[PDB]
Design a protein around this ligand. Sequence first.
Ligand code: NA
Length: 130
Amino acid sequence: KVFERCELARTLKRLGMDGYRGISLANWMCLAKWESGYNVRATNYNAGDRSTDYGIFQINSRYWCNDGKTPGAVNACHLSCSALLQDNIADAVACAKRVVRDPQGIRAWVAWRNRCQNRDVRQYVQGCGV
Ligand code: NA
């Protein structure tokens, strides 16, 4: 499933993402937009280090979820990476919350730095009723 902008915005708000660890809802929307284009099935293999990014937030298999084929990996979210490909994004959200509980916060994703940081991100939630 590929979420529509406002549909996702309302879903994330209900899941308690607004202001989570100081991160505004619009920041999470900007992150999802640039990582997967709001597509829960997005997957990207990194030939360079043998890890894969999964789902709407493109969470990496080396640290956060287990896919079994990533060398020297941990599973901090204690989830199979398969869980991050579901239409129901509850597990992906719980794992995203875990990722930002680390010192880097939202900066853990380089795309956030490149296209969201210091930018006007209001556009991602405008008119959505959140
Ligand atoms: Na892993």
